[PDB]
From a paper:
[name] [name], so named by virtue of its homology to Escherichia coli endonuclease VIII ([name]), is a 252-aa monomeric enzyme with AP β-lyase activity on single-stranded DNA. The lhr–[name] gene operon of Mycobacterium tuberculosis and its avirulent relative Mycobacterium smegmatis encodes a pair of enzymes implicated in DNA repair: the Lhr helicase and the [name] AP lyase (1–4). Expression of [name], and its operonic neighbor Lhr (a tetrameric 3′-to-5′ helicase), is induced in mycobacteria exposed to DNA damaging agents. We demonstrate here that [name] has 5-hydroxyuracil glycosylase/β-lyase activity on single-stranded DNA.
Here, we crystalized [name] and determined its structure at 1.45 Å resolution. The refined [name] model (Rwork/Rfree = 16.7/20.5) comprised a continuous polypeptide from Pro2 to Ala251. There was no density for the N-terminal methionine, which we presume was removed by methionine aminopeptidase during [name] expression in E. coli. The protein consists of an N-terminal lobe (aa 2–116) and a C-terminal lobe (aa 123–251) connected by a linker peptide. The N lobe is built around two four-strand antiparallel β-sheets (β1↑•β6↓•β7↑•β5↓ and β2↑•β3↓•β4↑•β8↓) that form a β-sandwich, which is flanked by the N-terminal α1 helix and two short 310 helices. The C domain comprises a 4-helix bundle, a β9-β10 hairpin, and a tetracysteine-zinc complex. A strong anomalous difference peak was detected overlying the modeled zinc atom. Weaker anomalous peaks were detected over the Sγ atoms of Cys225, Cys228, Cys245, and Cys248 that bind the zinc ion. The N and C lobes are arranged in a saddle-like shape with a deep groove between them, in which the N-terminal proline (Pro2) is located, thereby demarcating the AP lyase active site. The saddle groove is lined by positive electrostatic potential that provides a docking site for the DNA substrate, as seen in structures of AP lyase-related enzymes.
Numbering used by the authors: 2 to 251
Write the structure that this text describes.
Amino acid sequence: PEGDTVFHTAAALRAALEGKTLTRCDVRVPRYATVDLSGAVVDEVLSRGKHLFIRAGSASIHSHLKMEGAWRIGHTKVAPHRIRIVLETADTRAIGIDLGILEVLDRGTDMDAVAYLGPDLLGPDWEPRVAADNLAADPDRPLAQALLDQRVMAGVGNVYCNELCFVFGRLPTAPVGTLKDPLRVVQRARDMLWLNRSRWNRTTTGDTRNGRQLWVYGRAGEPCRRCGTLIQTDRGGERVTYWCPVCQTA
Ligand SMILES: [Zn+2]
């Protein structure tokens, strides 16, 4: 999950839970087995970068999504991974599966958990100059590592990292110092995530149709949509990269 998925999940949970009294709060995490927020209203569901917070009563349920489809809404219980939490209201059910962190924090201090985050690409008070100065603060830093650092700005994961590198004509190992305009980079990242904040069908090309949605990610061996050259890929290091060797040069 990247920042768009997490924001969208927060929105889906808001539709299911926000403003409603919890009828069930079953936290299947050992330290939190005794938490039972039933009888409290879910006052707010919000995202902070790749983090989710569910505020109810005096508590804030903090989760960090490692798996797409991590929170599921509806009454179907069959799932590919372990159910870690069930929340219900009179009319709705939300289940959290394969969550990374799932913890119950004090509501009043819940933002201390994530106060170090850089500007949130999908947060209400986004600040592109802060993100741009953070991104450019160390010009010898490799571009992809800087984009993926949640203290620089919050929300880019491997898909958006690959896509941003393509639209700016840079290899992921290019130093940030080679960017003509770091402000433009972070503004385009904001625009890309914003366009997908309510779209699970992640699209960066402007064309949402099947097979048309991304420039390079997941497209090894397919033609670049601009120059026609076949897309290349490398699976060394942490993350898989995809790039057009004509549009993205050293
Ligand atoms: Zn190309």
